[PDB]
Amino acid sequence: DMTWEGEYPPSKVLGPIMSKMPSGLLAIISMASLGVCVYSCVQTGFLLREPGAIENGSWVRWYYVVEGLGGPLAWGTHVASWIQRKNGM
Amino acid sequence: EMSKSIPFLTVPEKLDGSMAGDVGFDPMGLSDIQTDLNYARWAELKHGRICMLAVVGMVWQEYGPHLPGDAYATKDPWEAISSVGFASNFQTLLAIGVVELANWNKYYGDGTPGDIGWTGGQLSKMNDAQIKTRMESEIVHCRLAMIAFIGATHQTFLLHKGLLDFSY
Amino acid sequence: AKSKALPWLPNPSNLDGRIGANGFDPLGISEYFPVDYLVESEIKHGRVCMMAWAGYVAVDLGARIYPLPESMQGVTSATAHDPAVAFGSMGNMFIWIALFEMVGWIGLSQTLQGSGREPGDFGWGKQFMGKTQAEIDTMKLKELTNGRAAMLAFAGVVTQSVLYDKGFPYF
Numbered sequence: 125d126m127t128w129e130g131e132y133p134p135s136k137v138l139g140p141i142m143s144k145m146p147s148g149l150l151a152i153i154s155m156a157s158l159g160v161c162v163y164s165c166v167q168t169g170f171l172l173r174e175p176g177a178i179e180n181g182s183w184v185r186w187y188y189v190v191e192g193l194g195g196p197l198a199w200g201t202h203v204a205s206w207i208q209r210k211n212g213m
Numbered sequence: 214e215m216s217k218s219i220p221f222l223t224v225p226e227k228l229d230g231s232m233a234g235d236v237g238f239d240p241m242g243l244s245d246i247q248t249d250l251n252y253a254r255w256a257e258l259k260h261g262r263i264c265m266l267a268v269v270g271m272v273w274q275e276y277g278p279h280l281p282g283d284a285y286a287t288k289d290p291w292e293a294i295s296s297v298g299f300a301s302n303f304q305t306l307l308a309i310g311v312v313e314l315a316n317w318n319k320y321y322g323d324g325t326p327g328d329i330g331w332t333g334g335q336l337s338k339m340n341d342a343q344i345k346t347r348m349e350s351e352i353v354h355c356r357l358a359m360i361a362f363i364g365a366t367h368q369t370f371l372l373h374k375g376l377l378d379f380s381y
Numbered sequence: 382a383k384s385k386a387l388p389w390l391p392n393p394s395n396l397d398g399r400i401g402a403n404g405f406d407p408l409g410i411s412e413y414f415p416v417d418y419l420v421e422s423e424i425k426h427g428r429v430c431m432m433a434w435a436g437y438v439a440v441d442l443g444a445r446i447y448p449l450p451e452s453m454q455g456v457t458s459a460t461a462h463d464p465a466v467a468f469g470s471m472g473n474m475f476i477w478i479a480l481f482e483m484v485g486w487i488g489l490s491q492t493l494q495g496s497g498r499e500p501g502d503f504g505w506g507k508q509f510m511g512k513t514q515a516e517i518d519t520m521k522l523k524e525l526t527n528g529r530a531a532m533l534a535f536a537g538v539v540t541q542s543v544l545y546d547k548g549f550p551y552f
């Protein structure tokens with residue numbers, strides 16, 4: 125079923141949804157996601173490095189935590205875009 | 214195909230309307246893995262019957278004539294256990310145990326689920342349909358008691374007020 | 382085949398033959414995501430908003446029930462969530478909402494796995510939906526049309542109200 129041969133995997137391996145998405149769209153999403161993750165890290169870094177005022181772990185912000193999850197998604201999306209491109213879609 | 218109780222879900226196969234109280238309710242599908250629903254029915258009845266007595270008892274003890282003697286006067290249902298003592302409780306436990314072990318084969322057997330012979334003269338001289346009606350009444354009452362038990366107990370420990378005390 | 386709403390763009394095909402299909406899916410979400418999920422979501426969002434909008438406006442035009450908890454006195458539709466959540470109103474309704482939602486999740490799963498439950502159908506009050514498929518369909522569009530308006534309506538009410546601290550008119 126999912127077994128594949130050659131130089132690129134079939135689109136079926138990308139799931140039931142992304143298997144229908146265009147390569148360019150996935151690329152756009154990938155870049156955006158990575159940006160959010162990096163932004164979150166840099167911003168949080170300032171909080172951790174600001175004198176005092178972060179007692180009781182005030183540096184942890186819900187938004188930044190969620191944003192940081194974009195990094196792993198960025199990897200997946202960028203890999204998927206390549207697969208879609210090779211598959212022709 | 215579609216459950217009567219829940220109109221937007223498919224009814225599990227085992228629920229076919231044969232047993233009493235089958236309103237086609239098994240959203241989580243706990244009936245498929247089971248060979249039959251006999252043991253489960255025994256439990257439903259047992260749990261419900263105990264709950265029936267419990268709810269009645271709780272109300273009585275809170276608002277009713279207690280038995281003569283101290284240590285048998287505490288209205289608080291939970292405190293009663295300790296107050297009455299180990300001896301009293303143990304004797305009841307042993308009695309229940311005897312009955313449970315005596316009817317062991319019935320519980321794990323293939324007979325009518327819930328029937329241990331204590332039918333009085335009732336459920337006699339009546340057609341099968343009438344019998345089913347009686348059995349349905351029991352299961353409905355069992356389920357009601359179980360829901361009530363949860364509510365009564367929770368209300369007691371959360372609101373800390375008598376069951377029949379209705380104040381807002 | 383060009384879409385009716387956006388004549389210069391191709392028509393979304395998977396959405397064809399559905400209630401309220403005006404050919405509007407510029408970003409093509411339908412081409413990727415399961416349609417039944419999307420349809421169910423649109424309906425739920427609409428129904429929730431319809432009620433939400435009504436509640437917001439009602440309370441803003443007075444309407445408080447009797448007797449009313451003292452803590453709830455002097456509260457606008459906005460700035461009422463917190464007083465209520467403290468009293469217990471919100472939590473006491475959350476429980477029941479959760480129950481229905483969980484059973485609904487089971488329904489959605491079966492729908493997506495192929496059971497025959499039309500997206501958004503909970504078998505409630507179908508008696509008033511009419512008999513002819515045509516009238517049934519009109520009723521469905523009526524719900525959807527009102528629902529879409531409600532979603533937008535609620536957004537305006539809440540955003541405009543908080544931003545400029547205003548009452549019913551321009552809430």
Ligand code: CLA
Pocket residue numbers: 263266267269270271273274277278279280284285286287293294296297301305308309312
């Ligand atoms: C779930 C069942 C249940 C349990 C575990 C208890 C437990 C208790 N009750 Mg109680 N009670 C119950 C039901 C129950 N009650 C019911 C249904 C009533 C109303 C008739 C009462 C009326 C009641 C009073 C008036 C008093 C208690 C008291 C007590 C405590 C001392 C024991 C005693 O004197 O009981 C007395 C028991 C009875 C008067 C009758 C019990 C009715 C049984 C359950 C009938 C079932 C028998 C069964 C079908 C056949 C035997 C089973 C097997 C062992 C052979 C004890 C904590 C005493 C107390 O306050 O202690 C501080 C007390 O004064 N109970």
Ligand code: CLA
Pocket residue numbers: 357360361363364365367368371372374378379380
């Ligand atoms: C048979 C089950 C049962 C019954 C009869 C009651 C009855 C009662 N509970 Mg209770 N409860 C139960 C189960 C039950 N509970 C369970 C399972 C729990 C969770 C463990 C609780 C937790 C609970 C709490 C935490 C509180 C109560 C309270 C109350 C009292 C006021 C309830 C109220 O204001 O509702 C008002 C009802 C509404 C606002 C909604 C309207 C009712 C809907 C719309 C339709 C009702 C019709 C329906 C068929 C009910 C008929 C069944 C019944 C007549 C037999 C009342 C005596 C409150 C109290 O002060 O009591 C001391 C209280 O604080 N209960």
Ligand code: CLA
Pocket residue numbers: 428429431432435501502503504505506507508509510520521523524527
């Ligand atoms: C104008 C709004 C509107 C319309 C036209 C419909 C139409 C429909 N709904 Mg529906 N619904 C709505 C709002 C609406 N709904 C809201 C707000 C909710 C959430 C509370 C729901 C929840 C709901 C469920 C859970 C289900 C339906 C279903 C249905 C369909 C079955 C036909 C039916 O039930 O009678 C439709 C006939 C009418 C609505 C005529 C009534 C005329 C209005 C309502 C006057 C009523 C007076 C006033 C509005 C009552 C106060 C309510 C408010 C103030 C709180 C039908 C297409 C069922 C279905 O199978 O769908 C496919 C179904 O399972 N609906």
Ligand SMILES: CC(=O)O[C@H]1CC(C)(C)C(=C=C/C(C)=C/C=C/C(C)=C/C=C/C=C(C)/C=C/C=C(\C)C(=O)C[C@@]23O[C@]2(C)C[C@@H](O)CC3(C)C)[C@](C)(O)C1
Pocket residue numbers: 431432434435505506507509527528530531533534535537538549550551552
């Ligand atoms: C057991 C059984 O069968 O029961 C039956 C009962 C019954 C009743 C028959 C049934 C039903 C159906 C129901 C519940 C129907 C109710 C539907 C409902 C509640 C529909 C509201 C829409 C709200 C809209 C469109 C808001 C528009 C608001 C708009 C367009 C605005 O512009 C508002 C505005 O604020 C803005 C945003 C900006 C402001 O500056 C200006 C103003 C103020 C103008 C069921 C389902 O069959 C079940």
Ligand SMILES: CC(=O)O[C@H]1CC(C)(C)C(=C=C/C(C)=C/C=C/C(C)=C/C=C/C=C(C)/C=C\C=C(/C)C(=O)C[C@@]23O[C@]2(C)C[C@@H](O)CC3(C)C)[C@](C)(O)C1
Pocket residue numbers: 148149151152154155158161165192193194195196198199202205
């Ligand atoms: C035609 C069109 O339209 O576009 C075209 C033109 C254009 C734009 C040039 C093209 C492109 C796009 C490209 C090249 C796109 C992307 C390439 C890319 C994106 C390559 C790697 C990302 C790797 C990551 C994120 C690795 C790890 C992420 C890791 C390791 C994390 O741990 C995240 C982390 O989260 C944890 C788990 C915990 C968090 O709390 C914090 C941290 C941060 C530690 C294409 C392909 O030609 C298509």
Ligand SMILES: CC(=O)O[C@H]1CC(C)(C)C(=C=C/C(C)=C/C=C/C(C)=C/C=C/C=C(C)/C=C\C=C(/C)C(=O)C[C@@]23O[C@]2(C)C[C@@H](O)CC3(C)C)[C@](C)(O)C1
Pocket residue numbers: 259262263266280281282283285305308309312313329
């Ligand atoms: C010195 C003297 O003489 O003065 C006396 C005077 C006076 C006033 C009498 C006194 C007293 C009080 C006394 C003696 C009190 C005795 C109290 C006693 C003996 C109290 C409960 C037994 C409880 C039972 C059986 C409960 C449940 C049994 C239950 C709940 C069952 O469900 C059984 C079950 O079968 C069902 C129905 C269905 C089956 O499928 C499942 C099982 C098997 C589980 C004094 C003051 O102490 C001393």
Ligand SMILES: CC1=C(/C=C/C(C)=C/C=C/C(C)=C/C=C/C=C(C)/C=C/C=C(C)/C=C/C2=C(C)CCCC2(C)C)C(C)(C)CCC1
Pocket residue numbers: 195196199200
């Ligand atoms: C049989 C045998 C044996 C065993 C063996 C084994 C058991 C092996 C295993 C092996 C393995 C088991 C391996 C593994 C590896 C792994 C890897 C190599 C990984 C990698 C990873 C990665 C690459 C990652 C990536 C990422 C990132 C970075 C971020 C984003 C996301 C992700 C996660 C994707 C012995 C020698 C003892 C002896 C002889 C016989």
